[PDB]
Design a protein around this ligand. Structure first.
Ligand SMILES: C=CC1=C(C)[C@@H](Cc2[nH]c(/C=C3N=C(/C=C4\NC(=O)[C@H](C)[C@H]4CC)C(C)=C\3CCC(=O)O)c(CCC(=O)O)c2C)NC1=O
Ligand SMILES: C=CC1=C(C)[C@@H](Cc2[nH]c(/C=C3N=C(/C=C4\NC(=O)[C@H](C)[C@H]4CC)C(C)=C\3CCC(=O)O)c(CCC(=O)O)c2C)NC1=O
Ligand SMILES: C=CC1=C(C)[C@@H](Cc2[nH]c(/C=C3N=C(/C=C4\NC(=O)[C@H](C)[C@H]4CC)C(C)=C\3CCC(=O)O)c(CCC(=O)O)c2C)NC1=O
Ligand SMILES: C=CC1=C(C)[C@@H](Cc2[nH]c(/C=C3N=C(/C=C4\NC(=O)[C@H](C)[C@H]4CC)C(C)=C\3CCC(=O)O)c(CCC(=O)O)c2C)NC1=O
Ligand SMILES: C=CC1=C(C)[C@@H](Cc2[nH]c(/C=C3N=C(/C=C4\NC(=O)[C@H](C)[C@H]4CC)C(C)=C\3CCC(=O)O)c(CCC(=O)O)c2C)NC1=O
Ligand SMILES: C=CC1=C(C)[C@@H](Cc2[nH]c(/C=C3N=C(/C=C4\NC(=O)[C@H](C)[C@H]4CC)C(C)=C\3CCC(=O)O)c(CCC(=O)O)c2C)NC1=O
Ligand SMILES: C=CC1=C(C)[C@@H](Cc2[nH]c(/C=C3N=C(/C=C4\NC(=O)[C@H](C)[C@H]4CC)C(C)=C\3CCC(=O)O)c(CCC(=O)O)c2C)NC1=O
Ligand SMILES: C=CC1=C(C)[C@@H](Cc2[nH]c(/C=C3N=C(/C=C4\NC(=O)[C@H](C)[C@H]4CC)C(C)=C\3CCC(=O)O)c(CCC(=O)O)c2C)NC1=O
Ligand SMILES: C=CC1=C(C)[C@@H](Cc2[nH]c(/C=C3N=C(/C=C4\NC(=O)[C@H](C)[C@H]4CC)C(C)=C\3CCC(=O)O)c(CCC(=O)O)c2C)NC1=O
Ligand SMILES: C=CC1=C(C)[C@@H](Cc2[nH]c(/C=C3N=C(/C=C4\NC(=O)[C@H](C)[C@H]4CC)C(C)=C\3CCC(=O)O)c(CCC(=O)O)c2C)NC1=O
Ligand SMILES: C=CC1=C(C)[C@@H](Cc2[nH]c(/C=C3N=C(/C=C4\NC(=O)[C@H](C)[C@H]4CC)C(C)=C\3CCC(=O)O)c(CCC(=O)O)c2C)NC1=O
Ligand SMILES: C=CC1=C(C)[C@@H](Cc2[nH]c(/C=C3N=C(/C=C4\NC(=O)[C@H](C)[C@H]4CC)C(C)=C\3CCC(=O)O)c(CCC(=O)O)c2C)NC1=O
Ligand SMILES: C=CC1=C(C)[C@@H](Cc2[nH]c(/C=C3N=C(/C=C4\NC(=O)[C@H](C)[C@H]4CC)C(C)=C\3CCC(=O)O)c(CCC(=O)O)c2C)NC1=O
Ligand SMILES: C=CC1=C(C)[C@@H](Cc2[nH]c(/C=C3N=C(/C=C4\NC(=O)[C@H](C)[C@H]4CC)C(C)=C\3CCC(=O)O)c(CCC(=O)O)c2C)NC1=O
Lengths: 177, 372, 164, 177, 177, 177, 164
């Protein structure tokens, strides 16, 4: 199943897979504290469309040179491509939260990101500022400390997964440092 | 009812208050027209008696109505003035058309589109184009019945072809205003032993005169053409094409299949797992109302719905001409087949048991109701 | 068929318009009239075998000629065809009390009667004698209401007026 | 053609049966909502011009592919046809609400509507969305749940006629699908 | 009464299937959450013509080589076939939301569809993105968080139905890949 | 259109031949029974109203499925049409007996009779029975073997015209079968 | 003009027949409806000067741009033309409350409205602002009976649907 989930990612083509409820309880037994961890991914990706639309909007309000003419978020071809890199960080850290490892995050996403941002003129000091908002956004969502959208939850503690995603977000930022 | 001499009523043109009745019937149209020498002679008011003027008005204006003796007293009102000379035979078919006996076998029983096509068949003896329908379908929308029959009888096409003394008939004029307009006239006018009453849908000229291309089928025009103009080609060659058409023209086999709506489907061996070609493109046609408690929800299975080939010409041809500067950067030698595309977890909502999650990778592009 | 509804709906469609306030006003009469004619229908349907039996032979009592040979009633079975021939007429005036107009009588019993009763030598004066024997036998206290006896008689003489 | 009164005679004509007191009370039940039916048709044609102009423009505002050039509802003639084309559907459903059965619009309006719209090139999926707005507002008026226009009525139940007109508007949609 | 619905959807000898007044609450007592489940299908099938026209155009605006010469949505014989095929997936998934089982969806809709699409040359890279738009379009209509259209409902939570169609659209994503 | 003298001229128009003394004596034999044909047409139209009325009632008296409701001769208007429908068949075979060849009825009566009776719902097996009574009675008149009506003639042979009108009455039967 | 009598007496004449039982039944509706609408006509004729003074000005309260120069309202007298130009409509609603149909409304007020209001530059939206201001101000306790206000509203919106 997780090797079948590995067959979703690495195939270099669009693929999809689900897990039925007979196969689901084997996955909750194989991973530890998995009812938190399946709630951990579902807290993020249900609010992922506002998470990248506020973090890269918060990158602009701290650095307004990207909406200068000639700046790298000036046209809407580039502005939609900045959110397209914003979401594709956020899915690949969510599956890394879901599988519990970081090896799919390095090999499928971050191998070759420094070699493609310098070749494209992407400001690496500004995109580290964009992903650190997404580090700060996700720790509010994982501890239910968002001020606008608070979600219902089976109560308890999930601060171990709060430190797990902050070990995933800085691995993005160390890859583009 | 009006006067023993009346050329024109209703004062539509100004020059009919001074217009005499025609003293003699009008001549034939002056082109050559090779077909009409095989045709029977036209019946007028001043060559023939009232036994055959009434029959040919029943054979052309009434189609083939089978009016009884107690049926149509409104025609017997209008015929009793024509024998007294109180109105011309041009005005008589205006009185036939505005009467309810024309209405209660052609207006209420046929469709809205078919009522116009039967009016060109009866009054003018031809079949219209699409622009002639589109000017006649607005009179049925804004002005009604009586003004729409005024558009035939007070037209200049009627008065040049028949005038005030000639019974309507199929006028073969040889040189036509369109090559379609000959053979759409001929298809609309079959010979004897045909009526309009069984075909409550006509459905064949209702889709040849609908779009301006797709002229009608040749055996549907070789059928009512006259004789020593069809023979040695209707012994057994096109004759089985005529009989297979007649079982389709009768009972109104709807021409979605072979006439217009022309989709090259895949062969039956290509799918074979979504099998049973009777059930291949069927969907649940579901409908909910949700009002009080008389409020049904009727999941029917729908028929084989076809790609409509014009909503796929609105889509994918007019718009989606996105189509610009797709160089997308081209650095990414490590992307290795897909580049932009998130793991896309998507948790199927945890209703506490027997409900589970699956994941699927996809390329992700941000939408157009997104940033700024 | 030719009801009061199909009168006003086809007239609103031949003008090419919506149902106007005259046409909604025409159906409001049917609440005041269906309470009288629909109980005349079930008084006809609950007594239809008697009004064909003791009133179909009154044509033969008036016209005792036609049971002679060479004529329209030859044997016993054409008399059984004749009581079938008048049972359809009493079905149709039951079929027009339920409609409210004269709709089902015209094209189903009337239209074409001048053709088939001339070729098959069926005397229409013997038809209308049996129908008018049913017409004058209405009364208020036995048969129906005092109002339903007007309209049940008002459909029967229309069959007299159309056959003669 | 066939009203609600003449529907039970052609069922009885095939049986050669007299109409009797087993189904006359079913027809006498129809007369009992005589004024309930009568006000309902009057509330339809009250706001009939505002009915179709909100329906066609609502079909435009969710699918703006017909206003684009090459579209079916592009030019000023064909929008005048399309405002007229949905007006005939409102005109004939109102006949069936007055006649009590779908028999007048079936052989006049729907008979040959399918291949008329195919041969002219009407997008048939947008014609479903056109009359589904006219279905949901026809039940909005005769249950008087319309928010911007409230009409005074004698109080009572009218939901039996609401299933009547909603059984007509998908008969139009099935005849064009 | 669901066995009357399940045949007619496997195309047995009935033409259609109508549910009455007393049977409708009998259907609502049969399945669980019968008031919300009929409201969820009524949100889907009222906007089925808008959704598959957006998801096909969403598929084209991601990968614009489909309407290039050599593509699969060039030659509008094919483009009307792809606009047909999006509706057939949406009409089968809206039945499965109504029935509550995916058992009709697996045997009538999805067996051999992987074999049909490799025999027709339909690309599985873009066909997954056609479904993945329609998962997000159906899940926004159910919780009424669509951007343009806000439809009126009795208030409450519908996220148990919203995660139900995401399981049902994932079975389309599994059986195509 | 084509009579018996004009039938051999279109047989000679296809050969571009002058019609001469090798087939004029075959046409002089046609004038030799000129009066035999002339008395034969008069005997058909003598008792012409009693011809068709006995023929359609003989078709009724062997098959009372038409007088049953749902039958095609049930109502009063259809019996008035069926009295007149078989009368036109008598009216055109009396034309073709006078013209000497089956050309006047094959285009005015038979061209279009099949699809009119199919779309009306006329039972074709009953009209076969209806005109074959008229075959057996037209040869009963012109052989003077009618039992209830004997007409005076010059004595002689007339069975060459008996197969002539019997060939016409299977031409109307073949075009309706 | 187009009444409930002249609908059913012209459809009987275009068929060429006598007034049957469907045509006699439609006049029986007028016994049940003339008590409702003829009271509304006396409420309209007794208050016609009020319902154009404090309801004809409400179009100008909605459209104050019309009194600008170069428009359809220039001086004092065209506003005095305008209250006559609205009073002819309220005479025509009174002219069809006593008929029973939409007879005198069509050829006297509607038929030809798309010509004279387009050529002379009169906005028809400012007509129906004045007419529908009279429509929503109906109520049961002050104005009329409960049934008269249904029919009086049913002739006003027909004028809205004709001009729009
Ligand atoms: C009169 C003399 C003169 C100048 C001084 C420059 C001034 C200048 N630089 C840029 C424009 C720019 N300048 C930078 C440069 C930088 N951004 C960064 O993030 C780096 C940290 C930093 C350089 C060390 C970038 C990345 C762009 C946008 C690239 C582009 O416009 O093509 C633009 C915008 C041009 C446009 O809109 O296309 C202008 C006017 N140009 C001149 O003609
Ligand atoms: C210059 C302009 C400007 C902005 C665009 C915002 C950008 C912004 N947002 C947040 C911070 C946040 N942003 C979100 C995101 C969201 N909140 C929700 O409930 C939605 C679901 C979603 C989109 C609206 C959340 C949940 C937080 C954390 C709130 C908190 O810090 O308590 C932070 C603090 C985190 C950090 O600094 O790293 C910043 C700078 N602030 C700005 O000054
Ligand atoms: C099918 C898909 C699927 C899901 C979406 C999740 C949903 C889910 N989470 C928990 C259950 C839980 N979820 C959390 C997690 C949290 N609680 C909080 O208050 C924090 C905000 C958050 C930390 C991230 C905790 C602490 C529990 C209870 C302990 C546990 O079961 O893990 C339960 C069990 C609840 C019960 O039975 O009572 C379920 C079904 N699990 C699944 O199988
Ligand atoms: C719409 C209104 C309308 C009418 C009122 C009648 C009027 C009328 N009657 C006749 C025609 C006639 N009307 C009569 C009638 C009579 N002559 C007598 O000697 C009697 C006094 C009287 C009968 C009671 C006769 C006999 C003819 C025929 C004249 C003839 O040719 O001999 C004609 C000429 C048409 C025809 O000849 O058939 C007309 C228009 N017809 C209508 O359409
Ligand atoms: C008698 C009954 C009767 C009907 C049922 C309708 C049906 C109908 N519609 C049209 C004709 C048409 N109908 C439409 C309508 C539409 N196209 C769309 O994209 C929308 C979905 C929809 C509007 C809601 C258009 C646009 C045309 C004209 C096509 C063209 O020429 O461009 C025509 C041909 C006549 C004409 O072109 O004017 C007919 C008969 N009209 C009738 O008279
Ligand atoms: C005949 C067809 C038919 C239907 C279409 C439904 C319509 C319907 N839904 C509800 C009733 C309801 N419907 C919803 C559903 C929702 N509310 C939301 O805020 C979400 C947007 C949406 C989820 C899909 C909710 C929450 C209720 C209240 C009952 C409940 O909480 O379960 C009710 C009962 C109360 C009412 O009238 O509103 C009815 C009749 N039922 C039927 O019988
Ligand atoms: C597998 C994982 C994966 C990724 C990580 C991204 C990485 C990535 N980004 C871009 C491409 C881009 N990326 C950006 C992004 C940014 N520029 C800024 O100013 C911001 C700092 C930042 C957004 C927050 C922009 C603006 C482009 C387009 C550059 C251009 O059009 O010239 C491209 C080129 C392909 C294309 O977009 O056409 C790639 C491969 N895509 C992937 O498939
Ligand atoms: C460049 C090409 C391009 C497009 C063609 C569109 C296509 C498109 N639409 C939506 C997304 C959607 N599409 C709809 C559908 C509709 N919304 C309505 O209001 C109507 C009733 C109905 C037909 C238009 C809905 C409800 C959503 C989700 C919320 C929203 O965006 O409105 C999404 C997001 C899906 C996802 O995030 O997975 C996309 C990609 N966007 C693009 O980037
Ligand atoms: C629906 C139509 C309908 C009818 C007209 C009667 C017809 C009818 N009347 C009588 C029988 C009778 N009918 C009458 C007539 C009348 N009796 C009175 O009290 C009134 C004054 C007057 C109403 C006209 C009389 C006096 C008899 C008894 C004497 C007789 O048989 O003539 C009989 C025989 C015995 C019987 O069945 O009653 C029949 C079948 N039945 C029907 O079903
Ligand atoms: C010429 C114009 C004209 C009409 C159009 C009708 C309208 C009309 N309706 C009702 C009377 C009524 N009408 C309704 C109907 C409704 N009430 C509602 O709340 C629903 C919105 C609507 C159903 C769709 C009801 C419920 C009654 C009371 C019960 C009844 O009499 O049916 C009555 C009184 C009957 C009585 O109480 O005796 C009249 C006269 N009559 C007319 O004279
Ligand atoms: C994008 C642009 C856009 C529009 C143009 C409108 C169009 C529109 N209106 C309604 C929905 C409706 N439309 C009406 C119609 C009217 N209400 C009145 O008071 C008047 C009499 C009449 C318009 C003049 C009614 C009564 C409803 C039901 C909801 C309501 O009561 O408001 C619906 C939903 C149909 C359905 O639920 O199936 C739509 C799409 N909405 C949009 O989103
Ligand atoms: C039982 C359920 C069921 C389905 C799922 C569809 C499946 C399906 N699609 C096609 C047939 C097709 N399907 C597509 C569809 C597509 N190509 C693309 O690029 C897109 C990814 C996708 C549209 C979204 C095309 C383009 C064809 C036509 C192939 C061709 O003509 O080359 C056929 C062949 C039969 C025919 O079209 O006549 C079938 C069975 N039909 C069904 O009955
Ligand atoms: C306008 C009215 C009119 C007619 C209808 C014909 C009838 C007619 N027939 C014959 C003469 C004849 N007619 C017949 C015909 C028949 N005898 C039979 O037994 C058969 C029943 C029947 C054939 C179907 C025969 C057999 C002769 C004698 C031979 C002959 O002259 O042909 C003659 C005399 C010819 C002669 O003998 O010189 C005439 C004048 N002529 C007319 O002027
Ligand atoms: C022929 C039709 C006709 C009318 C509708 C009225 C119209 C009308 N109403 C008011 C005057 C009023 N109209 C109302 C409205 C109402 N009052 C109530 O008791 C109800 C609750 C509600 C019915 C909708 C109120 C509250 C006033 C007094 C406040 C005001 O002037 O607006 C006035 C100004 C002063 C007056 O004369 O009363 C006029 C012309 N007159 C008419 O001749």
């Amino acid at each position: 199943m997780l090797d079948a989930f590995s067959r979703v990612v690495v195939n270099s083509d669009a693929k999809a897979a689900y897990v039925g409820g007979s196969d689901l309880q084997a996955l909750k037994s194989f991973i530890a504290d998995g009812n938190k961890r399946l709630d951990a991914v579902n807290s993020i990706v249900s609010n992922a469309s506002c998470m990248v639309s506020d973090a890269v909007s918060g990158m602009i309000c701290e650095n307004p040179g990207l909406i200068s003419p000639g700046g790298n978020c000036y046209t809407n071809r580039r502005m939609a491509a900045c959110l397209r890199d914003g979401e594709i960080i956020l899915r690949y850290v969510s599956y890394a939260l879901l599988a519990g490892d970081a090896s799919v995050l390095e090999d499928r996403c971050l191998n070759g990101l420094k070699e493609t941002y310098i070749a494209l003129g992407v400001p690496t000091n500004s995109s580290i500022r964009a992903v650190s908002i997404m580090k700060a956004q996700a720790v509010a969502f994982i501890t239910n400390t968002a001020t606008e959208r608070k979600m219902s939850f089976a109560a308890g503690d999930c601060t171990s997964l709060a430190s797990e995603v902050a070990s995933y977000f800085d691995r993005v930022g160390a890859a583009i440092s | 009812l009006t006067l023993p001499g009346t050329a024109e009523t209703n004062l539509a043109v100004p020059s009919n208050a001074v217009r005499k009745v025609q003293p003699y019937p009008i001549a034939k149209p002056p082109s050559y027209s090779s077909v009409d020498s095989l045709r029977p002679a036209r019946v007028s008011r001043m060559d023939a008696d009232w036994a055959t003027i009434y029959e040919q008005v029943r054979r052309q204006v009434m189609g083939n109505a089978y009016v009884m003796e107690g049926e149509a007293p409104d025609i017997d009102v209008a015929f009793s003035q024509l024998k007294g000379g109180n109105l011309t035979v041009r005005e008589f078919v205006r009185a036939v058309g505005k009467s309810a006996s024309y209405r209660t076998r052609f207006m209420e029983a046929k469709s809205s589109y078919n009522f116009v096509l039967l009016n060109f068949k009866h009054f003018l003896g031809r079949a219209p184009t699409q622009e002639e329908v589109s000017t006649h379908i607005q009179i049925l929308a804004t002005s009604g019945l009586e003004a729409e029959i005024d558009s035939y009888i007070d037209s200049d096409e009627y008065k040049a072809l028949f005038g005030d003394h000639v019974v309507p008939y199929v006028v073969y004029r040889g040189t036509y205003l369109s090559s379609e307009r000959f053979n759409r006239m001929v298809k609309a006018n079959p010979g004897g032993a045909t009526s309009d009453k069984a075909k409550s849908n006509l459905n064949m000229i209702a889709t040849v005169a609908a779009d301006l291309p797709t002229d009608a089928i040749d055996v549907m025009r070789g059928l009512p053409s006259p004789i020593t103009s069809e023979t040695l080609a209707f012994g057994t060659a096109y004759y089985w094409a005529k009989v297979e058409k007649e079982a389709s023209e009768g009972r109104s086999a709807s021409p979605i299949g072979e006439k217009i709506g022309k989709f090259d489907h895949a062969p039956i061996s290509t799918y074979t797992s979504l099998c049973s070609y009777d059930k291949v493109n069927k969907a649940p046609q579901i409908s909910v109302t949700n009002v009080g408690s008389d409020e049904h929800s009727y999941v029917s299975v729908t028929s084989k719905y076809i790609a409509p080939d014009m909503a796929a010409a609105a889509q994918m041809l007019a718009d989606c001409q996105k189509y610009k500067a797709g160089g997308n950067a081209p650095t990414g030698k490590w992307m290795k087949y897909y580049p932009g595309t998130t793991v896309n977890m998507a948790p199927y909502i945890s209703l506490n048991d027997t409900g589970s999650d699956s994941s699927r990778t996809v390329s992700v592009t941000l939408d157009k109701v997104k940033i700024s | 068929m030719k009801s009061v509804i199909t009168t006003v709906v086809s007239a609103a469609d031949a003008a090419g318009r919506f149902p106007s306030n005259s046409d909604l006003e025409s159906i409001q009469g049917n609440i005041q009239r269906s309470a009288a004619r629909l109980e005349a229908a079930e008084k006809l349907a609950g007594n239809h075998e008697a009004v064909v039996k003791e009133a179909g032979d009154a044509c033969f009592a008036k016209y005792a000629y036609l049971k002679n040979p060479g004529e329209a009633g030859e044997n016993q079975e054409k008399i059984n065809k004749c009581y079938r021939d008048v049972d359809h007429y009493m079905r149709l005036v039951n079929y027009c009390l339920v409609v409210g107009g004269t709709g089902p009588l015209d094209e189903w019993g009337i239209a074409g009667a001048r053709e088939v009763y001339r070729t098959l030598n069926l005397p229409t004066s013997a038809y209308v004698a049996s129908i008018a024997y049913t017409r004058d036998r209405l009364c208020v206290p036995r048969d129906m209401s005092a109002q339903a006896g007007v309209e049940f008689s008002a459909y029967l003489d229309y069959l007299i007026n159309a056959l003669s």
